[PDB]
Design a protein around this nucleic acid. Structure first.
Lengths: 143, 50, 111, 116, 100, 48
RNA sequence: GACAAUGGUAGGAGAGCGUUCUAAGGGCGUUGAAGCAUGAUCGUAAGGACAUGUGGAGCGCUUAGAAGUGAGAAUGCCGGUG
RNA sequence: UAACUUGGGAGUCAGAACAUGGGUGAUAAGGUCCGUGUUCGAAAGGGAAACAGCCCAGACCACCAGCUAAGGUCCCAAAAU
RNA sequence: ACCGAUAGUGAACCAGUACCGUGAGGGAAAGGUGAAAAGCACCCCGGAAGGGGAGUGAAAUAGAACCUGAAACCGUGUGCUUACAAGUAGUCAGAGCCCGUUAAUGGGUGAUGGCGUGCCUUUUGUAGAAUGAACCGGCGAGUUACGAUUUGAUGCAAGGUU
């Protein structure tokens, strides 16, 4: 029974910054959902969280491939009879680019009490700057 | 209508979270020296002393 | 040392008594005698006696001055119940319960 | 002779209630309900012994992949190299050898690479 | 100085004075055993190779033979009058490592 | 010796009581199968 | 010691545990029996022990024999409490 | 590695889907009535998102051990961005 | 090699009675203080009932609602845990925190992850929105007499047996 598990006491976490310039929405989202989850460090510890905080920058520059800016609809419901709304992925990005990236990455993390706490490590901002200079966020390069 | 399921000891004891009587809220009288109801007379000896 | 007092087979139902016992459990002697005398409930003139006679054993059997006493234990238990019936409509009957309780109070000097 | 049941029914309805303590509500109190839950618990345990040997293997494989990716080589590639090299160390030891010591692990990555 | 032995169809990480539990051997209590199949000698000492290192035996003393904690193997099939109940205690041997 | 007796070997056997649980092999239905005329009490057919 | 075998309903075959009573032998009990309560104990299972309380006069063990011999379900019968 | 023979004890007589030959219906029906196989009934485990009957495979018990089957390797979710 | 108070007579308890019916008629429930009443003088709280002491006794947690006193159910105190969460409520993995046993890979609690649609009847097929059970305790269903046929055992054997 020689197996090592990691507890809150022995876990540390880093801060990274990813740039969305010239990146596909689904080719960037997949790689960020493996950092938040902590599948790059040797002590995986599925019961405990070991992931790292990431900061997206320039999230407007995100790019879609083929006729999607007018042929991809995001639907929602408000529980009232007949109330079902929709907005095209083009207009969403010219309106609220933080939401676009942030609702694609979260559809790749599990839906449990623990995947809800790993979705709070994602900070998204359209501008080339970010207000988190108080830490030491080092850059991470997507492969 | 009739009840479909029995009620457990847990769900019964939550309902009575609020089934309690409050403190009468009394004060000492500056004659009798005995607790009396506010804005009433001292029963032990009647002196309202408005 | 603690003096106790019991009233066995009082005729008020047990979960009507329990509403009052809460208001006094933890209070002080003179405060407890006053609450049971300014409350509108029906179990007050009986519970008060069980308390006015726990303080007569706290000083006549043992020797404690009745000023520094607290109420430590106050609970109401069950007693044997009486079976009764009340005739309903269209030739049918239903049962009735005349419930009973035991009341118990322990006063102590915190030593 | 007349043989009435005595103390033989009570003696085996308490062997079943003691096996159910910590169960919620009435499942640790009443016999009819605690007997069904004691039965289901055994069936789950038999199934859960088998899956414990599957769960832990997919834990050692994630750890080893995350250690190997640092040296620009996939878990699949590394495993194929080790077989050629005839090292024969199972998944559990490689994960422990990696977590405890980084240097020993490198001495393996290199051999697998040489094997190709 | 840790090594990787191969005793009971399994492998075990071993350190000096570590208490390790393995499958039932024939050696008597209070005797001294030895392991002839060592796979990996490393850590502080020189990293070595495989299938098996040359020489490199590991020695230990036997402390107790025993029987593990009891379990109960119950199963059934619903709506069909079919149940079964069995017990089990797996035996073991406890050793202490004293020379790698 | 009236306190250590043993009959011949092979001779006595224990009778079979049906309807005494599931692990005997003769439990619920007691060796009759399911509904019919040979499953009711009072029996099924004439000797002919 | 070697090899082979071991999912199971209706159903057929084999070996076992426990309960009350009796015969013979051998024992424990006011220096506390049965039974009731708690425990982290031993058997492949049905099950068997040993300590500690509560109680206050009866009860086990070995080998045979005889059965009102085992309960979770019948809109089952009776009592108690929700 | 089975066969037949004489004696003791039985249960069963409401079957279902899938593939392939045909009636009947309309080259309709998870329709129905026959021939020929298998699986369910009486069969757990892995895949088909969930899904008795479909593809793989027949559980004596224990294990933080190895090599494979159908099906698979961007993330949820183990293994090729 | 019959029962031991749900048993044995309907009936161990003033029972063919309390009661139910115009009538013929039906028909229950209910045993146990101690060896001996030695069945709690007197004192205190209270209108009493009921208590707290002091005494009787081997024992009053033996006080006439009297041996023992199980489970449902109702309470009082407390060691770990719970107010962003979608739960056949368990089972395997697992930190943190509190105790110390019929001493052995100990006991209690459980943040968080994986798997996971009660039991019984009846059916080709039931998580089933098909049936049954409010819960706990007691009682509640292949037997015997005589004949027939086949297996095992024992005795004698061209005899065997009343």
């Amino acid at each position: 029974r020689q197996t090592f598990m990691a507890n809150e006491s022995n876990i540390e976490r880093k801060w990274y910054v990813i740039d969305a310039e010239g990146q596909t929405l689904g080719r960037l989202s997949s790689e960020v959902a493996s950092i938040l989850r902590g599948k790059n460090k040797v002590t995986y510890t599925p019961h405990v969280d070991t992931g790292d905080y990431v900061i997206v920058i320039n999230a407007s520059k995100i790019e879609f491939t083929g006729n999607k800016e007018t042929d991809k609809v995001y639907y929602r419901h408000s529980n009232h009879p007949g109330g079902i709304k929709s907005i095209t992925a083009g207009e969403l990005r010219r309106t609220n680019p933080e939401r676009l990236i942030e609702n694609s990455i979260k559809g790749m993390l599990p839906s449990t009490r623990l995947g809800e706490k790993q979705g709070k490590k994602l900070f998204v901002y359209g501008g080339a700057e970010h207000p988190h200079a108080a830490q030491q966020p080092e850059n991470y390069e997507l492969r | 209508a009739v009840p479909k399921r029995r009620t457990s000891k847990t769900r019964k004891n939550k309902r009575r979270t609020h089934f309690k009587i409050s403190v009468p809220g009394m004060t000492e009288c500056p004659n009798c020296g005995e607790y009396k109801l506010s804005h009433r007379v001292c029963k032990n000896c009647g002196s309202y002393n408005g | 040392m603690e003096a106790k007092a019991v009233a066995r087979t009082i005729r008020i139902a047990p979960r009507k008594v329990r509403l009052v016992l809460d208001l006094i459990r933890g209070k002080n002697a003179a405060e407890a005698i006053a609450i049971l005398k300014l409350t509108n409930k029906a179990s007050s003139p009986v519970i008060e006696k069980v308390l006015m006679s726990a303080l007569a054993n706290a000083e006549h059997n043992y020797d404690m001055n009745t000023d520094e006493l607290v109420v430590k234990e106050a609970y109401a238990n069950e007693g044997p119940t009486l079976k009764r019936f009340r005739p309903r409509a269209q030739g049918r009957a239903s049962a009735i319960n005349k419930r009973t309780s035991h009341i118990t109070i322990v006063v102590s000097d915190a030593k | 002779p007349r043989v009435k049941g005595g103390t033989v029914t009570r003696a085996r309805r308490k062997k079943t209630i003691k096996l159910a303590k910590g169960y919620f509500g009435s499942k640790h109190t009443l016999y009819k309900v605690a007997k069904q839950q004691v039965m289901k618990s055994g069936q789950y345990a038999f199934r859960d012994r088998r899956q414990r040997k599957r769960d832990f293997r997919k834990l050692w494989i994630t750890r080893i992949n995350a250690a190997a990716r640092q040296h620009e080589m996939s878990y699949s590639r590394l495993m194929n190299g080790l077989k050629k090299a005839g090292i024969d160390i199972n998944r559990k030891m490689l994960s422990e050898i990696a977590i405890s010591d980084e240097k020993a692990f490198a001495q393996l990555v290199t051999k697998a690479k040489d094997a190709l | 100085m840790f090594a990787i032995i191969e005793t009971g169809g399994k492998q075990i990480k071993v350190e000096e004075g570590q208490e390790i539990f393995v499958e039932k051997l024939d050696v008597n209590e209070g005797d001294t055993f030895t392991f002839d199949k060592v796979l990996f000698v490393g850590g502080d000492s020189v990293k070595v190779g495989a299938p098996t290192v040359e020489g490199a035996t590991v020695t230990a003393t036997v402390n107790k033979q025993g029987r593990g904690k009891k379990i109960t193997v119950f199963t059934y099939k619903r709506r069909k009058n079919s149940k079964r109940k069995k017990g089990h205690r797996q035996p073991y041997t406890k050793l202490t490592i004293d020379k790698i | 010796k009236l306190h250590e007796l043993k009959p011949a070997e092979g001779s006595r056997k224990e009778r079979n009581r049906v309807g005494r649980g599931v692990a005997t092999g003769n439990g619920k239905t007691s060796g009759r199968g399911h509904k019919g005329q040979k499953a009711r009490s009072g029996g099924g057919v004439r000797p002919g």
